[PDB]
Write a protein that holds these residues in place. Structure first.
Motif, PDB file in Angstrom:
ATOM      1  N   UNK A  94      87.702  49.807  49.494  1.00 37.00           N
ATOM      2  CA  UNK A  94      86.929  51.094  50.330  1.00 37.00           C
ATOM      3  C   UNK A  94      85.674  50.517  50.727  1.00 37.00           C
ATOM      4  N   UNK A  95      85.405  50.722  51.916  1.00 38.46           N
ATOM      5  CA  UNK A  95      84.079  50.223  52.377  1.00 38.46           C
ATOM      6  C   UNK A  95      83.273  51.663  52.795  1.00 38.46           C
ATOM      7  N   UNK A  96      82.284  51.960  51.986  1.00 38.54           N
ATOM      8  CA  UNK A  96      81.614  53.255  52.385  1.00 38.54           C
ATOM      9  C   UNK A  96      80.472  52.840  53.250  1.00 38.54           C
ATOM     10  N   UNK A  97      80.936  52.843  54.668  1.00 42.67           N
ATOM     11  CA  UNK A  97      80.035  51.840  55.828  1.00 42.67           C
ATOM     12  C   UNK A  97      78.498  52.543  55.790  1.00 42.67           C
ATOM     13  N   UNK A  98      78.778  54.026  56.243  1.00 41.28           N
ATOM     14  CA  UNK A  98      77.438  54.442  56.621  1.00 41.28           C
ATOM     15  C   UNK A  98      77.615  55.988  56.310  1.00 41.28           C
ATOM     16  N   UNK A  99      76.373  56.511  56.293  1.00 40.99           N
ATOM     17  CA  UNK A  99      76.192  58.232  56.489  1.00 40.99           C
ATOM     18  C   UNK A  99      75.300  58.480  57.590  1.00 40.99           C
TER      19      UNK A  99
ATOM     20  N   UNK B 299      74.397  49.848  51.173  1.00 40.25           N
ATOM     21  CA  UNK B 299      74.263  48.470  50.706  1.00 40.25           C
ATOM     22  C   UNK B 299      75.234  48.469  49.413  1.00 40.25           C
ATOM     23  N   UNK B 300      75.604  47.487  49.096  1.00 45.73           N
ATOM     24  CA  UNK B 300      76.902  47.286  48.091  1.00 45.73           C
ATOM     25  C   UNK B 300      77.762  48.331  48.201  1.00 45.73           C
ATOM     26  N   UNK B 301      78.255  48.589  49.374  1.00 43.64           N
ATOM     27  CA  UNK B 301      79.083  49.762  49.697  1.00 43.64           C
ATOM     28  C   UNK B 301      80.655  49.326  49.740  1.00 43.64           C
ATOM     29  N   UNK B 302      80.966  47.947  49.479  1.00 45.41           N
ATOM     30  CA  UNK B 302      82.285  47.557  49.665  1.00 45.41           C
ATOM     31  C   UNK B 302      82.914  47.239  47.972  1.00 45.41           C
TER      32      UNK B 302
END
Length: 166
Positions: free
Chosen positions: A15-20, A63-66
């Motif tokens: 899971x990459x929570x890339x951006x909001x 950051x630290x999204x992955x």
């Protein structure tokens, strides 16, 4: 000590929570995202870090999204769990002087990945492996009330099937 059934596959889910983006609150949020999905092996929460300020009309890359999760299960079980149990990504507001505040939740439907194109790759001993990937933007809905879209989350997920467990 403890085996798993021989028909189990080694999967890697990431899971990459890339951006909001598109914050719809009037005040600045010192944002982290947090989730738990014990199907992958642990109820220990995963979170972005450090907090990042989000204000209206910007995309903030987390950051630290992955995170990648290696686990063993049956294909049938992965299918049912991804169809039935949503991944709940929590938007928290953090501040040094104040207690941590839960603002909302994005509901990610993991089974979206199951209809994606399956592409082949080779494992570290030439074994036949498969990869699927999926990307979308989903709403963060307010925690206390309902249907209130407060932010959007752009993420990517990947599922790799390394075949039968060794």
């Amino acid at each position: 000590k403890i085996a798993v059934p021989a028909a189990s596959h080694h999967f890697c889910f990431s899971v990459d929570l890339r951006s909001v983006h598109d914050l719809e609150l009037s005040f600045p949020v010192n944002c982290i995202l947090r989730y738990s999905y014990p199907f992958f092996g642990s109820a220990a929460p995963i979170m972005t870090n450090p907090p990042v300020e989000v204000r209206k009309n910007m995309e903030v890359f987390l950051p630290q999204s992955y995170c990648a999760f290696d686990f063993a299960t049956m294909p049938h079980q992965l299918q049912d769990t991804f169809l039935r149990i949503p991944l709940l990504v929590e938007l928290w507001h953090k501040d040094k002087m104040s207690k941590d505040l839960l603002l909302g939740v994005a509901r990610i439907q993991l089974s979206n990945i199951l209809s994606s194109e399956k592409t082949r790759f080779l494992g570290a001993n030439g074994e036949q492996c498969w990869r699927q990937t999926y990307s979308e933007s989903v709403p963060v809905i307010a925690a206390q009330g309902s249907n209130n879209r407060i932010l959007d989350l752009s993420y990517t997920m990947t599922l790799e099937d390394y075949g039968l467990v060794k």
